[PDB]
Amino acid sequence: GSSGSSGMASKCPKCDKTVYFAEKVSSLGKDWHKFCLKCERCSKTLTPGGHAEHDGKPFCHKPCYATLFGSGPSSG
Ligand SMILES: [Zn+2]
Ligand SMILES: [Zn+2]
């Protein structure tokens, strides 16, 4: 099997993995994965360098983000 983890790249705030320069995507001043760059609420293709973030996980401007950040959450 492959020996060593020669990468020389920043980790991923999604899977805490060594983002490869080949699939390296700069966004919000960080390095994510072409597969990790997917909303968790709407689960729709996002764009690197034009989205919101909360707790490390990305989220569309709204209502995605909006909801997460609001009073009187879903209940009853
Ligand atoms: Zn990742
Ligand atoms: Zn979304």
Curated annotation (Swiss-Prot):
Top-level division of the source organism's lineage: Eukaryota
Entry annotated with the keyword Zinc: yes
Residues where N6-acetyllysine is found: 30
Protein name per UniProt: Cysteine-rich protein 2
MF terms in GO: zinc ion binding
GO cellular component: cell cortex
Region of the whole protein represented: 1 to 63 of 208
Tissues of expression: Widespread tissue expression; highest levels in the heart.
Domain LIM zinc-binding: start-end pairs: 12-64
Keywords: Acetylation, LIM domain, Metal-binding, Phosphoprotein, Repeat, Zinc
Biological process per Gene Ontology, one example term: positive regulation of cell population proliferation
Subunit details: Interacts with TGFB1I1.
